[PDB]
């Protein structure tokens, strides 16, 4: 049909523009911040993918939770998540953000940031390398590329 073709091409356009202009807000909590900074450093250079370095939280498209989430900061994480405009994504970077990690059995650590915010990409490592984080960001772009917002809207 014509309408299905039109909403498919518009889905492809808006998914292209969203995955090719991802703006991150990095929670530089712990040691994974150093490796996000290496993913911004000139060897890997996220800025050539259209992924800018340190966009403000009220204009960013993806929240990279890079470090250990403690109990004292989990409401601040959730408040910054609630202040992000949609579509917002969450990359969980490294073991403490993924599942608690080396501080999993601690009294003061949230056992993974997925107890606090919905998470799209889990990037494993302690820390994951800057290349592994850039792999996770390209996998997030591939996840955005196969979104079907207007096709489901046309089929609802």
């Amino acid at each position: 049909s014509r309408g299905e073709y039109v909403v498919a091409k518009l889905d492809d356009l808006i998914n292209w523009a969203r995955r090719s202009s991802l703006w991150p807000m990095t929670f530089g909590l712990a040691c994974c911040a150093v490796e996000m900074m290496h993913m911004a450093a000139p060897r890997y250079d996220m800025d050539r993918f259209g992924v800018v370095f340190r966009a403000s939280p009220r204009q960013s498209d993806v929240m990279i939770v890079a470090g250990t989430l403690t109990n004292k900061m989990a409401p601040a994480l959730r408040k910054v998540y609630d202040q992000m405009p949609e579509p917002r994504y969450v990359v969980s970077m490294g073991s403490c953000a993924n599942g608690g990690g080396y501080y999993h059995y601690s009294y003061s650590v949230v056992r993974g940031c997925d107890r606090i915010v919905p998470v799209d990409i889990y990037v494993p490592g302690c820390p994951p390398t800057a290349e592994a984080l850039l792999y996770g960001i390209l996998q997030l772009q591939k996840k955005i590329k196969r979104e079907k917002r207007l096709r489901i809207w046309y089929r609802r």
Partner: protein, 176 residues
Amino acid sequence: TYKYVNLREPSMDMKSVTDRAAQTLLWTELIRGLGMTLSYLFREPATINYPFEKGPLSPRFRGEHALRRYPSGEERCIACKLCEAVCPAQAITIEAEPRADGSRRTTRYDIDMTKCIYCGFCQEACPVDAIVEGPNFEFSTETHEELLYNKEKLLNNGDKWEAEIAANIQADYLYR
């Protein structure tokens, strides 16, 4: 055995005073900084073309975990639980029993990859080179429980990456 950073008295003759005033009014060090930034403008950047170009790794690299085999297909793990005793984050969960040929083998070999600190104490505690931490670092998932590897997943990582893992161990086993 020590030195004084910033203990210089500037010269007060008219030559040096006029040098400092030409610096103040004519912005000479600011042009120096613009020159250094212009100098990096015309350099070749250090940017590799990921994913087509890859960061250089060593054979010691500690990435994704894999249970290995012998050159007969028999799995190397003889269920001794040294890796989960040494495991600093308690990521390794092991249950064992004698199987049908009476061999000491595991029935559970789980590694929570979201507890794992990727320090490789398991592969150096292992007496038979069964668990290793292989060279894969590109294994990001979309779901948390996809990073909760059981024995089937780890044996499949061994079968997947063994051609590379064996050569890395061949490079580094004389340092171990």
